[PDB]
RNA sequence: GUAUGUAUUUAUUUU
RNA sequence: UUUUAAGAACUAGAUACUAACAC
RNA sequence: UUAUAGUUUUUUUA
């Protein structure tokens, strides 16, 4: 319990940020391979 | 509508599974019931042997030049596309009927008559469905694994226990991920979707075009095309068997990265335009 | 005035074909059939009035009068005729009295009732009046087929 | 302001006005002869006259058999009157409602005040320029009538108000509710089977919370479809009102919202039904349903709600599939009718049918799945679509009565840490009955 | 018991 | 030119965090 | 336990 406790220094807010940011990156990757597979159909859809 | 562009014979046994090069669209990898894999040009390029028994599933990697094939021999075999030789052999699966390659993590997801889903470090075992596991998929955000089993359920997994259970199916033999963040799940007579589709008995694979067209292969040989938004069925076709009326069915199917590729139980691949 | 014609035709029976319940072309016909069947039920109740709640008969007839006129003139909305016909259809099946009551429950809740053996509606005051009496036709029928 | 906003809701005010005065629409709806009554003619009341105090109008016009002698206006309890000053036929009441306060706790100055002023005022609507005032302060429960007088009503009023102010429920809704807020309540069986129709509402299946992953981590709450389970114990046609989670979409805590949509469904079903098929009672184990039921059950003092006196096992209803099979299939909420007893009215009376049925529910409550196997152990005789429980022979039903019975006794003695061998009969009958 | 935050593209921008 | 995971199967649950859900 | 419930120092008898 303690040996696990010491190792995280931040507090709820920072961790919350780590998540939010990664979720943004999943959004990016997804939207990309959206556009990639649409290029494999040749139809070119512009990014927002 | 759709129609029949091309017929490709050349497998000795049935065609169980088909996957397509995710980058250049230049070829197929097609399993077989003869244990081989024959890489077709979207002519026959090469033959990849090395399984002793039939190949239920094949999946090609995006970020990697790797090809993960999996069979009834209880083994998940890697393939290095560069030099075309088996690199790695997995394990834990005394037949494995599904492989799906997690997009961003360098993971494998395998499943089969084990009734468990194994996350392979290219680590986790997911206790789960009460029967064999037919079809498995991977997603970048939450639930990262969707699974479908012959207990007639579909589970949405949290890999880091079940996040959600979907019981509305009355065996779920096929799923496909819409390239909208949803899934299309199948059963005997009713093809549903999950974040309905009108079907009379079609009993008993699915594929989703980027145009929101939802393909459904029959075991009666009928090709049931749908719109994905509505649920409407705008077309139903019937394949010509070959030069038995029982052998007419559709084992697998896929779309490229405007064409359709369906391996059939008649020992032929057909290309629908 | 075709409704004035269908009502005078002796070629229409009380038997309801469930396959016609949702038909657009058969609406005028089905509407008259419902009118004819309800009269037939009230007729058998009349014939055995002393044996089955005679004190409720008159009130039931009065509540059904406006519905019958509407059925005779094909004035019921599509969804409403569909629900009523479904109830009456199952009622014509002795071993389907429970499917009739189930259909009746939907109708009373404002939902469309489709044949079960084989979305929404709105209810008014005078309409609520005849929907209530329909339940009386159901209870009578159960008693009738049970006591003979 | 908080506490009051409790005390009145769903227009409990308006309901009060109807219950009282409309119930007089009965009592002097039927009195024709002795007072020379042609008919009871009242104007259709706009919905706001109950809670809008701007100005008032003639309510319920008495149109005499023959003729009537209007004395100069006095109170109900203002006595001695010479009626013959005038004559009318058509009449009316002014009967109203105001919650008074420690300044004005005497209505009568308000009675004659408002009455007089109204009568002599333009905006006041009258068919007859004679009539009667009956007001009430719900505050101190006072009431009064300052009318013009043609003879004979006076005690009919007097005594009748003794009844009303002691009876017509909405009052007793207050005097319940005010005591809720005030927290003063002064300190110091088989008949279920009698003729009139007795119904069973049990709501524990109505809102089913479903625990699910919290995006980050936490314990997530949700729900999945319920339905309202009601039956009469006798004739076995189930009323299931489907609860389709769409219902809960946007709002609040759904504990209160549960209880209130249960009440409104049960009521709507009742109202819609015929006077012949309506219940004469209602019986529920969960008494959190009292207030919602009641408050929607003002409208029917005919019916009478009665609770449980006795410990009861109804929460297993869903674990017996086919109905739950129906719960999970519904796209849109609807009623469905079913069959409780399989067919138990041939081979039994409903009597020991219901004893065996409770016992079934029991062994479904404690150990569950052992009981479900007991039922379906040999499926090789199969349940039809209409039945629910596994169809049996005589002996199968009978011994399974014994075994299901046995569970809670044995599991009991083990689990509750008090022995089964030292028992006395009446505690056995207790847990069996409850 | 909640504030707070996020996305909600339908009507085809030239090879 | 890089790399190599001991592998597979079976098992119960204790300490856990939290729950606009049950006095 | 209801018509809620982050700041309004949260909780004691003759």
Q: Is the CB of A26 inside 8 Å of chain B's CB atoms?
A: yes
SS3 (DSSP) at D255: helix
Other residues' Cβ atoms within 10 Å of the Cβ of residue D279: 22
Tell me which H or E stretch contains C136. Answer: helix C125-146
Q: Which residues of D185-222 are buried (b: 16+ CB within 10 A; e: fewer)?
A: eeeeeeeeeeeebbbbbbbebbbeeeeebeeeeeeeee
> Whats the size of chain B, residue-wise?
273
Method: cryo-EM
Which residues, including other chains, have CB under 8 Å from residue B249's CB and lie 6 or more apart? B217, B218, B219, B220, B221, B264, B265
* Residue B109 near residue B100 (C-beta atoms within 8 A): yes
Which residues, including other chains, have CB under 8 Å from residue D324's CB and lie 6 or more apart? D318
| Domain residue ranges of chain B, discontinuous segments joined by + | 1-273
Token code pair at residue B74: 């209880």
In whole angstroms, F5 C1' to B149 CA is 29
Which residues, including other chains, have CB under 8 Å from residue B178's CB and lie 6 or more apart? B184, B208, B212, B228
In this complex, the residue of C56, C98, C128 whose CB is nearest that of residue D237 is C98
Q: Which residues of C10-36 are buried (b: 16+ CB within 10 A; e: fewer)?
A: eeeeeebebeebbeeeebebbbbbbbb
Q: What is the resolution of this structure in A?
A: 4.0
Q: Is the CB of D212 inside 8 Å of chain B's CB atoms?
A: yes
* Residue D139 near residue D103 (C-beta atoms within 8 A): no
Name the β-bridge partners of B77.
Answer: B69, B89
Q: How far apart are CA B270 and CA B241, in angstroms?
A: 11
In whole angstroms, G12 C1' to D179 CA is 28
SS3 (DSSP) at D214: coil
Tell me which H or E stretch contains D268. Answer: helix D255-272
Cβ–Cβ pairs < 8 A, chains B and D: 9
Query: Which candidate, C97, C71, C62, C54, places its Cα nearest to that of C12?
Result: C71
SS3 (DSSP) at D404: helix
Q: Is the CB of D218 inside 8 Å of chain B's CB atoms?
A: no
Q: Is the CB of D219 inside 8 Å of chain B's CB atoms?
A: no
Chain B CB contacts of D215 below 8 Å: 142
Give chain F positions with protein CB within 7 A. 4-5, 7-10, 17-23
Tell me which H or E stretch contains D212. Answer: strand D212-213
Q: How far apart are CA D256 and CA D187, in angstroms?
A: 29
> Whats the size of chain D, residue-wise?
434
**Three-state SS annotation for chain A:** CHHHHCCCCCCHHHHHHHHHHHHHHHHHHHHHHHHHHHHHCCCCCCCC
Sheet holding D281-283, edge to edge: D304-305, D281-283, D198-202, D226-231, D238-243, D335-338
Token code pair at residue B93: 């699966």
Q: What are residue D236's phi and psi, to 5 degrees?
A: 60, 55
> Which nt is closest to the CA of D181, judged by C1'?
G2
For residue D432, the distance in angstroms to the closest alpha carbon of chain B comes to: 36
Residue D256 CB lies within 7 Å of the nucleic strand G: yes
Q: Is the CB of B181 inside 8 Å of chain A's CB atoms?
A: yes
Q: How far apart are CA D392 and CA D166, in angstroms?
A: 55
Q: How far apart are CA B51 and CA B35, in angstroms?
A: 5
The region that residue B79 occupies, defined by phi over 0 for left and psi between -120 and 50 for alpha, beta otherwise, is beta
Q: How far apart are CA B163 and CA B101, in angstroms?
A: 20
SS3 (DSSP) at C51: helix
* Residue B248 near residue B237 (C-beta atoms within 8 A): no
Q: How far apart are CA C48 and CA C37, in angstroms?
A: 17
Q: How far apart are CA B138 and CA B100, in angstroms?
A: 6
| Cβ-defined contacts of B175-178 (< 8 Å, 24+) | B175/B135, B175/B137, B175/B146, B175/B148, B175/B206, B176/B137, B176/B205, B176/B206, B176/B207, B176/B208, B176/B214, B177/B137, B177/B139, B177/B146, B177/B208, B178/B208, B178/B212, B178/B228
Which residues, including other chains, have CB under 8 Å from residue B35's CB and lie 6 or more apart? B49, B51, B52, B53, B54, B55, B71
Token code pair at residue C25: 């072309």
- Domains annotated for chain C, with CATH where assigned, are 1-148 (1.20.940.10)
Place of tokens 């998929």: B137
In whole angstroms, F5 C1' to B206 CA is 35
The DSSP letter of residue D193 is: G
Give the gyration radius of chain D's Cα atoms.
Answer: 29
Q: How far apart are CA C60 and CA C66, in angstroms?
A: 11
Give chain E positions with protein CB within 7 A. 1-2, 8-9
- Strand E-proximal residues, CB under 7 Å? A 48; D 252-253, 255
């Amino acid at each position: 319990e303690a040996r696990a406790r010491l190792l995280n220094t931040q507090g709820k807010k920072a961790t919350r940020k780590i998540r939010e940011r990664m979720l943004e990156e999943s959004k990016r990757i997804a939207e990309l391979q959206k556009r990639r597979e649409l290029k494999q159909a040749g139809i070119n859809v512009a990014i927002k | 509508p759709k129609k029949v562009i091309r017929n490709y014979p050349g497998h000795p046994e049935g065609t169980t599974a088909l996957k397509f090069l995710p980058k250049t669209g230049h070829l197929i990898l097609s399993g077989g019931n003869d244990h081989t894999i024959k890489i077709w040009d979207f002519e026959c390029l090469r033959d990849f042997q090395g399984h002793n028994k039939p190949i239920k599933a094949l999946r090609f990697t995006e970020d990697c030049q790797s090809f993960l094939s999996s069979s009834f021999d209880r083994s998940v075999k890697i393939w290095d596309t560069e030099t075309g030789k088996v690199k790695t052999r997995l394990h834990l699966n005394s037949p494995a009927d599904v492989e799906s390659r997690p997009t961003n993590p360098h993971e494998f997801i395998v499943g089969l008559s084990n009734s468990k889903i194994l996350h392979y470090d290219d680590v986790q075992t997911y206790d789960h469905h009460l029967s064999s596991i037919l079809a498995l998929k991977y997603f970048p955000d939450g639930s990262k694994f969707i699974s479908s089993s012959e207990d007639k359920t579909v589970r949405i997994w949290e890999n880091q226990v079940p996040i959600k259970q979907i019981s509305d199916t009355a065996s779920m033999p096929f799923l496909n991920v819409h390239p909208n963040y949803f899934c299309a799940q199948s059963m005997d007579n009713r093809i549903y979707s999950f974040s309905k589709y009108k079907r009379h008995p079609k009993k008993i694979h699915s594929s989703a075009g980027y145009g929101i067209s939802l393909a459904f292969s029959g075991d009666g040989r009928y090709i049931c095309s749908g719109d994905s938004k509505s649920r409407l069925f705008t077309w139903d076709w019937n394949t010509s068997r070959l030069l038995i009326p029982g052998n007419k069915p559709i084992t697998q199917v896929d779309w490229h990265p405007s064409k359709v590729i369906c391996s059939g139980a008649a020992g032929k691949i057909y290309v629908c335009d | 005035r075709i409704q004035e014609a269908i009502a005078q035709d002796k070629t229409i029976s009380v038997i309801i074909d469930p396959s016609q319940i949702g038909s657009t072309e058969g609406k005028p016909l089905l509407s008259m059939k419902c009118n004819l069947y309800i009269h037939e039920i009230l007729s058998r109740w009349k014939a055995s009035l002393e044996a089955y709640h005679p004190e409720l008969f008159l009130d039931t007839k009065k509540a059904l009068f406006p519905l019958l006129l509407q059925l005779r003139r094909n004035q019921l909305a599509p969804d409403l005729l569909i629900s009523l016909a479904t109830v009456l259809y199952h009622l014509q099946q002795p071993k389907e009295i429970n499917l009739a009551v189930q259909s009746y429950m939907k109708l009373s809740i404002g939902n469309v009732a489709w044949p079960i053996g084989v979305a929404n509606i709105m209810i008014d005051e005078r309409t609520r009046l005849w929907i209530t009496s329909i339940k009386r036709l159901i209870t009578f029928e159960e008693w009738y087929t049970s006591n003979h | 302001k908080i506490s009051l906003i409790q005390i009145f809701r769903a227009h409990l005010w308006q309901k009060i006005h109807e219950s009282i005065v409309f119930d007089i629409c009965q009592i002097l709806d039927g009195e024709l002869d002795v007072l020379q009554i042609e008919s009871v003619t009242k104007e259709t009341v706009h919905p706001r006259k109950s809670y809008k105090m701007n100005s008032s109008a003639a309510d319920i016009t008495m149109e005499s058999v023959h003729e009537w002698e209007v004395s100069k206006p006095s109170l109900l309890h203002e006595t001695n009157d010479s009626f013959k000053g005038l004559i009318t036929n058509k009449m009316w009441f002014d009967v109203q409602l105001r919650y008074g306060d420690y300044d004005s706790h005497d209505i009568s100055r308000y009675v004659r005040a408002k009455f007089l002023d109204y009568t002599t005022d333009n905006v006041s609507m009258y068919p007859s320029p004679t009539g009667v005032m009956i007001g009430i302060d719900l505050a101190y429960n006072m009431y009064d009538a300052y009318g013009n007088w043609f003879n004979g009503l006076k005690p009919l009023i007097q005594n009748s108000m003794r009844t009303i102010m002691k009876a017509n429920p909405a009052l007793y809704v207050l005097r319940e509710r005010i005591r809720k807020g005030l927290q003063i309540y002064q300190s110091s069986y088989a008949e279920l089977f009698n003729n009139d129709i007795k119904l069973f509402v049990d709501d524990t299946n109505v809102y089913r919370v479903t625990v699910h992953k919290t995006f980050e981590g936490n314990v997530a709450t949700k729900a999945i479809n319920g339905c309202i389970f009601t039956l009469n114990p006798k004739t076995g046609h189930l009323f299931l009102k489907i609860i389709h989670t769409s219902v809960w979409a946007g709002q609040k805590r759904l504990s209160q919202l549960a209880k209130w949509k249960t009440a409104e469904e049960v009521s709507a079903l009742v109202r819609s039904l015929p006077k012949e098929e309506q219940p004469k009672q209602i019986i529920v184990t969960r008494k959190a349903m009292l207030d919602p039921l009641e408050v929607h059950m003002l409208d029917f003092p005919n019916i009478a709600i009665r609770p449980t006196e006795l410990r009861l096992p109804f929460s297993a209803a869903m674990s017996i599939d086919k109905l739950s099979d129906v719960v999970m299939k519904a796209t849109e909420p609807q009623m469905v009718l079913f069959n409780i007893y399989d067919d138990w009215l041939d081979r039994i009376s409903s009597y020991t049918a219901f004893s065996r049925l409770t016992l079934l529910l029991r062994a479904l409550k404690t150990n569950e799945e052992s009981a479900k196997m007991i039922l379906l152990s040999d499926p090789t005789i199969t349940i039809k679509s209409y039945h629910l429980w596994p169809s049996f022979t005589d002996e199968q039903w009978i011994t399974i009565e014994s075994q299901m019975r046995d569970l809670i006794l044995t599991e009991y003695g083990r689990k509750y840490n008090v022995n089964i061998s030292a028992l006395t009969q009446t505690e056995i009958k207790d847990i069996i009955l409850g």
